Design a protein around this ligand. Structure first.
Ligand SMILES: CO[C@@H](C(=O)N1Cc2[nH]nc(NC(=O)c3ccc(N4CCN(C)CC4)cc3)c2C1)c1ccccc1
Ligand SMILES: [Cl-]
Length: 281
């Protein structure tokens, strides 16, 4: 029916040129939801990504993947109703200052559970990065932005498409050879660096340069004051050879994760920190 009847927006929480995201309410139940509204008139090229995300999320049912509740059409606007996640993104939560290795290990663990779910459903996220990891106010950690996610089948054996964000992209994705879920494991290893240092490797460089640097160089390493097991976690992820990369399931039992990860509810203090930080200034 009419989405402006069914839903009420409470607060604009995100904005772009083609769309806006709100905190809002299902009026029938008073449930808080995320409401992403796309101006279909302005959307042009990225409309295929919108379609792809809706399709993939409608096929997902995991506590580690942002829920999709439906789409509504009202004039030039597409309303996409989604699980509200109010803690902020992992990247957002880096703003007030660095994470400790307990927080990092917990976040990576939860991402790994999400990747394990997706890969078992023969899906590939293909844009894993801290900005795409969204937290709930309880400290749950869930995956979002499925605009370029890919589907493996029997009609098509692997993927080829040059897609993702350059600094996080696997070398085999840059080369556009046949790749699979192991590409997400590379991106996860880059995300581990990003969680530790605040930025991905080569973050000051032009994206175009990174497209030849990533295949040309040895894999990035985590440098500085970070525990050996974290550096070995990064090292295992960022193997040039995908068949030598571990799976997400295996990584759940990496010693860095086992010795450092704790209950997700402990992440609420990371969210509190952001609230206080946000409020000031
Ligand atoms: C553009 O699509 C959305 C999207 O699909 N989504 C689906 C979905 N569900 N819930 C969301 N919540 C938030 O984005 C958000 C972010 C920061 C936030 N604040 C900062 C911390 N504070 C404690 C509260 C206020 C409050 C809410 C989103 C976004 C997207 C956004 C970012 C990354 C990936 C995807
Ligand atoms: Cl947006």
């Amino acid at each position: 029916a009419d989405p402006e009847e069914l839903f009420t927006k409470l607060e604009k929480i995100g904005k772009g040129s083609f769309g806006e995201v709100f905190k809002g309410i299902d009026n029938r139940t008073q449930k808080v939801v995320a409401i992403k509204i796309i101006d279909l008139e302005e959307a042009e090229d990225e409309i295929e990504d919108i379609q792809q995300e809706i399709t993939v999320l409608s096929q997902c049912d995991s506590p580690y993947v942002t829920k999709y509740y439906g789409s509504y059409l009202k004039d030039t606007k597409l309303w996409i109703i989604m699980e509200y996640l109010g803690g902020g993104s992992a990247l957002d939560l880096l703003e007030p200052g660095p994470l400790d290795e307990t927080q990092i290990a917990t976040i990576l663990r939860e991402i790994l559970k999400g990747l394990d779910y997706l890969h078992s459903e023969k899906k590939i996220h293909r844009d894993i990065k801290a900005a795409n990891v969204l937290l709930s106010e309880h400290g749950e950690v869930k995956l979002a932005d499925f605009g370029v996610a890919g589907q493996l089948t029997d009609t098509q054996i692997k993927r080829n498409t040059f897609v993702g964000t350059p600094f996080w992209m696997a070398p085999e994705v840059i080369k556009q050879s046949a790749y699979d879920s192991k590409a997400d494991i590379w991106s996860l290893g880059i995300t581990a660096i990003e969680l530790a240092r605040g930025e991905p490797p080569h973050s000051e460089l032009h994206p175009m340069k990174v497209l030849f640097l990533i295949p040309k160089n040895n894999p990035p390493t985590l440098e500085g004051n970070y525990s050996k097991p974290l550096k070995e976690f990064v090292e295992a992820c960022l193997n040039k050879e995908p068949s030598f990369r571990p799976t997400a399931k295996e990584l759940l039992k990496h010693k860095f994760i086992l010795r450092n990860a704790k209950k997700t509810s402990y992440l609420t203090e990371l969210i509190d920190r952001y609230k206080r930080w946000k409020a000031e200034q």
